[PDB]
Structure formats: structure tokens, C-alpha cells
Amino acid sequence: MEHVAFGSEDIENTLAKMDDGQLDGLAFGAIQLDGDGNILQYNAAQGDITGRDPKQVIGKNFFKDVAPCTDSPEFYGKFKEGVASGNLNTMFEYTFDYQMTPTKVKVHMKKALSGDSYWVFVKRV
């Protein structure tokens, strides 16, 4: 188990050292997106929450293909403003309900340290 707490102030520095195997040891769901919303990384805890198979969703677009319930001003709209501005750090509750039992989660979106990548972190509430 990797010990990093959800919501930690310097989480992007800590997660910069992990490969996909290490990300699978986190206590919470983690998705890495490019600035178009394509999925680059998707960990085991996220798949436990959503039912998706991690290897199968890498390369898909999160907003168009995987998670249409997030294509809303309340989720996608926040992401796209962050990508446009080059800064993003926001936490909110949301319900995931596409092809699954409706599940309430806490979401933390934060710009990654390097380049044009963005984290989505998720835990149950």
C-alpha cells in the first residue's frame, strides 16, 4: 500500500514518482487525463469503485466515451476551464450513474506537475 492521503497539498509531487504499478497501491481512485480528456493512467482502486477494467479504458476519452454523466458544467466544465487557464485545484461531491449502481463520491481534480496532464482522484463518501 502507498501511503499518500487523499487531498494532500503536495500530492502532485508525490505521484510524479509512481509508475502504473505503484499507482495501484493507493487507497483512493486515480485517473490521469491529457488536456483533451483522454485517459493516460487508471488505477486499481478506481476500477473497484466503477467496475471498469483499467487496461480497457486507457486511451478512451473520459468525457465522451467512458463517463458521459460527467459531461456537464459541474464536472467537465471545471476541467476545461482548468486546462484553458493552466491551473486546476478543486474538490467536490458527485454521483456516478452510467451503466452502474449510482455511487456518490468525493472528486479532487488537480493539475499534474509536469506538462499537460491532469489528475482526477476519487473516494467513496
Ligand X SMILES: *C(=O)/C=C/c1ccc(O)cc1
Nine-digit cell at 64? Answer: 465522451
Among the residue ranges 14-22, 78-86, 95-103, 108-116, the one whose residues contact ligand X (CB under 6 A): 95-103
Q: How far is the CB of 123 from ligand X (least distance, A)?
A: 12
Closest CA relative to residue 29, chosen from 104, 112, 105 = 105
- Give 80: exposed, middle or buried? Use CB within 10 Å, 0-12, 13-18, 19+: middle
- Out of 81, 98, 104, 116, the only residue in the binding site for ligand X (CB under 6 A) is 98
Footprint of ligand X on residues 61-90 (CB under 6 A)? 66-70
Binding of ligand X at residue 92 (CB under 6 A)? no
